Design a protein around this nucleic acid. Structure first.
Lengths: 141, 75, 64, 191, 137, 141, 104
RNA sequence: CGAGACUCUGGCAUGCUAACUAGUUACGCGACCCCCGAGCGGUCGGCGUCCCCCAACUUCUUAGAGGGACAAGUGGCGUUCAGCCACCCGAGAUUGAGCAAUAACAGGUCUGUGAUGCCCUUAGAUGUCGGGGCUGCACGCGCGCUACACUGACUGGCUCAGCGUGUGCCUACCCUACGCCGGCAGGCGCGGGUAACCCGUUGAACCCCAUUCGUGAUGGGGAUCGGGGAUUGCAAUUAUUC
């Protein structure tokens, strides 16, 4: 057995659970590197925390992630939140506070809400329109 | 609106014109070449693909919708 | 007729005038002069301490 | 990367704001440098929020307009990245510096607001906020690029690049410049 | 950058570069986009090219396969008229000869006084669907 | 590795070429005049695509515990133009997809196994990995 | 021998369902049977949509009624009759309780 | 009294109690075993199936009880009040429904009602079967839908979901994985599932990608018409539909 914490990331619907366990591998998202996946037109965004905080930190732990829910963009945002949170979570209970705190400093300043949850989930549709707040055309003499 | 067509035959003169006008360009796309000549846009594109095996033009995009060529390294 | 361009910086957003309420009174410190400080109306949303580029102090911009 | 956060194949360094009145609504490195623009996809949450959004991100957002093209950011990001490359070949330089210059030159100074005067068509000469000047500039430039592309061979990327360069140093072949000269001229006149 | 090959005839129209071969052919009746595309595939001709490209040879090879469709394994379902009403076969109809048959069928069902015939002749809509505020302006 | 780690577009192209070398794909007496799917407004450009589809199907089956015609038909499926009515999802040709499953089985790329439909053969597992290696060296995108 | 028995409980009324479930669990263990503990299954929202207006002129007003059926099961393992016996007694109205011979 | 308050839903609980019609973790991981990479190799990491425990858990999934928002803390302002503004934490005093008073209206409904008054008709029906029309178009109006393209038409390929639902039903009946055949429509054989078991790891579309076409009513657009195949019904003529 090997040491392990789990965390999650949440944008809209699309939970992304990261299991951050002792070892060396990649960050893998659905078993494949961050580089792949596709749409890969947003690609730099999910690379971003890893580059900011060095790859040495995220290679002291193997990070494997299972993503379901939402769509392609929803998932990207979710994964980014879970990986950064993962690293911090692992260091917070096992390694040391100063490392996790340093990561929290670097992220929170430019900010991207990777340690606090997004509130925004779908607003309910109400009748008498074709949309949620969109409403049918009226006609008048 | 509008009505505009280009030659849709692959021609002699316009290919020669292209290669001998080459210092003018630093940006080359199909659309530009098409406008500046009378070559189609489709056969603008294709002329560039030929041209790239001189290597007076260098790929710097390879996107599906349309491609972007440079002239030499950077001009 | 003509005067030189004066940079003037928002000192205090006075409030909103206009018939529809879509004209904002502003007092702008004339910046070149601290003695002058004149009221000009700004169409846009105004955040204090941002800078206008006055092309005139002619044709005074005022409540309506 | 944490030393300076670059754009996704261009630098955020050597971008200069050539006006002292348009400051603090033009930024790209004054905290707001990004490899890939995206904040959280809200920008209407606070009235404060607009300051957070840099000129680059605002330009990508304003582009997606006209029903089919609405709500497709991914398409726009690909088009915009291509557009930067087209600018770089055409003038050398840094494409972001070209963008900044274009905004400054396209932004109006005086404009007009409606004022009553006998029921005759007269208006009051007013200066406008630098936030408004940036917002209007970005609008003009995006609308210009789209308008050209519609019934011409050139794509949105190419037309956007052409639109920025012409505005950056005047040529009178940029829509934004032509519109601005009309707004400022009319302002000066009036009652 | 090859001109040289230009001005091809398919049936009664001059076919030159404008569009890809397949689309270029569809000036004539009885050849849609799909028809001309499948004829070219059968005739072993790259259809991405122009019709100002390719010689007279290739054109004739296309014409033979279109007008003998079964005998070159263009199936019966793919045909504009299957079993027909005049002819006991299965015929691909092309050019001016389609116009002929269309006229024939409309006259035919005016004689026989079938509903399709009568409606079309009178200018009423042949399909039973609404024509209440449509089929005009 | 899983096949997902390496470049997906390059994988299917490399595998498709490997299939051509084998010299058989048990090809239909159709696919030279076909409608194909009803999501198509123009008949296929070439008769080449059958190899590409076969490679794609092999990859898709490698992922799953076993699957048949239904899985392939939805992936290849898209938007169907309904004329002047709203465009909606559908599933296109089933003869081709069935034929591809049969042909791959014949070569022993995939074989019938538990959880219904065809699942990968160890012969196929070996083949896919060899082209995976070639792809892995080439890029990652 | 112990026999695997499945008790399904179906209802619509949370509080009633919940305190039936309570009684089954508590009385089960009291004279020794398996405790387990409830496997909550997703409540199913039956939705009916109707026009609010007879005779439709005015505005489009729609009324939507829901009815939320709630399911749970509990798998007890212990011997034959004394399971289903001690469980199913001490309840009469208004919460369905099914004891099933299913599971081996 | 109405509204507020209230209730219900959406968001914040790695705290609480649970889960074999639900999953996850975590070994030991072996096999199918590929070497893809490391290691000489055993072994380690790996999408899935399979090994499964007297494993562990509720993180994703589920639904129960609990807490969290009160302008609370702090700072300005105000009759120093009621309240307002900013700031922290962060779901911020920013979610969406449900909810209707006093009273009016000749609003609509006798065709929802074996609720109903009077009137008509009633064995010669206005109580039932056979057939046609509502679907007829020189024209006016409204809600829509499809469009006018290159963020697209085209040909390959990548790939992620959610609310809900189903047969074995009190006047009539399902979703289909999976085999085969057919371009297609469709035909045909199985098996499971009143169901978070099976359909459905809901691997949907947008999206992403390499081309082709090249802004040209062009291949955008699919109107109108002609020929043919099938599906539904005992009956489709006035295209039921595909």
């Amino acid at each position: 057995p090997l040491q392990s914490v789990q965390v999650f990331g949440r944008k809209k619907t699309a939970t992304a659970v990261a299991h951050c366990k002792r070892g060396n591998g990649l960050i893998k998202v659905n078993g494949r590197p961050l580089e792949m996946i596709e749409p890969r037109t947003l690609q730099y965004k999910l690379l971003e925390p890893v580059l900011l905080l060095g790859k040495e930190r995220f290679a002291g732990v193997d990070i494997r992630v299972r993503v379901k829910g939402g769509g392609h963009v929803a998932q990207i945002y979710a994964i980014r939140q879970s990986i950064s949170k993962a690293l911090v979570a692992y260091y917070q209970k096992y390694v040391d506070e100063a490392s996790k705190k340093e990561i929290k400093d670097i992220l929170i300043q430019y900010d991207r809400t990777l340690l606090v949850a997004d509130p925004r989930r779908c607003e309910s549709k109400k009748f008498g329109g074709p949309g949620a707040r969109a409403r049918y055309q009226k006609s008048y003499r | 609106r509008d009505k505009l067509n280009n030659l849709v035959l692959f021609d002699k003169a316009t290919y020669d014109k292209l290669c001998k006008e080459v210092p003018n360009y630093k940006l080359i796309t199909p659309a530009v070449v098409s406008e500046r000549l009378k070559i189609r846009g489709s056969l603008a594109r294709a002329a560039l693909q030929e041209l790239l095996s001189k290597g007076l033009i260098k790929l710097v995009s390879k996107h599906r919708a349309q491609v972007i060529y440079t002239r030499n390294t950077k001009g | 007729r003509v005067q030189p361009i004066k940079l003037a910086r928002v000192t205090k957003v006075l409030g909103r005038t206009g018939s529809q309420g879509q004209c904002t009174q502003v007092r702008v410190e004339f910046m070149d002069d601290t003695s002058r400080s004149i009221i000009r109306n700004v169409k846009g949303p105004v955040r204090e301490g941002d800078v206008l580029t006055l092309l005139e102090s002619e044709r005074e911009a005022r409540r309506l | 990367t944490p030393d300076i956060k670059l754009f996704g194949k261009w630098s955020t360094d050597d971008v200069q704001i050539n006006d002292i009145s348009l400051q603090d609504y033009i930024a790209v490195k004054e905290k707001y440098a990004k490899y890939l623009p995206h904040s959280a996809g809200r920008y209407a949450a606070k009235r404060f929020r607009k300051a957070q959004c840099p000129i680059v991100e605002r330009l990508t957002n304003s582009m997606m307009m006209h029903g089919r093209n609405n709500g497709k950011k991914l398409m726009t990001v690909r088009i915009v990245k291509h557009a930067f490359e087209i600018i770089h070949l055409l003038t050398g330089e840094n494409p972001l510096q070209v963008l900044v210059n274009a905004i400054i030159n396209s932004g109006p100074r005086e404009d007009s607001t409606r004022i009553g005067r006998a029921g005759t068509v007269r208006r009051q000469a007013v200066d406008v906020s630098p936030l408004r000047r940036v917002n209007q500039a970005i609008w003009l430039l995006c609308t210009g690029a789209r308008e050209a592309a519609f019934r011409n061979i050139k794509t949105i990327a190419e037309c956007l690049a052409d639109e920025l360069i012409n505005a950056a140093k005047g040529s009178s072949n940029s829509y934004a410049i032509k519109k601005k000269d009309e707004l400022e001229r009319v302002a000066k006149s009036n009652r | 950058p090859e001109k040289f090959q230009h001005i091809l005839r398919v049936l009664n129209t001059n076919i030159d570069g404008r569009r890809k071969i397949a689309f270029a052919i569809t000036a004539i009746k009885g050849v849609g986009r799909r028809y001309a595309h499948v004829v070219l595939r059968k005739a072993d001709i790259d259809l991405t090219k122009r019709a100002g490209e390719l010689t007279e040879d290739e054109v004739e090879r296309v014409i033979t396969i279109m007008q003998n469709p079964r005998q070159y394994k263009i199936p019966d379902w793919f045909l504009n008229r299957q079993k027909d009403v005049k002819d006991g076969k299965y015929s691909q109809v092309l050019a001016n000869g389609l116009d002929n048959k269309l006229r024939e069928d409309l006259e035919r069902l005016k004689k026989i006084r079938a509903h399709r015939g009568l409606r079309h002749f009178w200018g009423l809509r042949v399909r039973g669907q609404h024509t209440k505020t449509t089929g005009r302006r | 590795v899983t096949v997902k780690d390496v470049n997906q577009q390059e994988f299917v192209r490399a595998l498709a070429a490997f299939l051509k070398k084998s010299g058989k794909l048990k090809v239909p007496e159709w696919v030279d005049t076909v409608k194909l799917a009803k999501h198509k407004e123009l008949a296929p450009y070439d008769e080449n695509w059958f190899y590409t589809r076969a490679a794609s199907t092999a990859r898709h089956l490698y992922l799953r515990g076993g699957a048949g015609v239904g899985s392939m038909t939805k992936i290849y499926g898209g938007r169907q133009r309904n004329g002047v009515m709203p465009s909606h999802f559908s599933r296109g040709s089933k003869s081709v997809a069935r034929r591809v499953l049969q042909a791959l089985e014949g070569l022993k790329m995939v074989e019938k196994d538990q959880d219904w439909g065809r699942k990968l053969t160890p012969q196929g597992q070996r083949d896919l990995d060899r082209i995976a290696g070639q792809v892995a060296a080439a890029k990652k995108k | 021998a112990i026999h695997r028995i499945r008790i399904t409980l179906t209802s619509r009324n949370v509080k009633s369902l919940e305190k039936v479930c309570a009684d089954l669990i508590r009385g089960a263990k009291e004279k020794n049977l398996k405790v387990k503990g409830p496997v909550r299954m997703p409540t199913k929202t039956l939705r009916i949509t109707t026009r609010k207006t007879p005779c439709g002129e005015g505005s489009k007003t729609w009324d939507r009624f829901q009815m939320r059926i709630h399911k749970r099961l509990i798998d007890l393992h212990s011997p034959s009759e004394i399971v289903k016996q001690i469980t199913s007694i001490s309840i009469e109205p208004g919460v369905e309780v099914e004891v099933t011979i299913a599971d081996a």
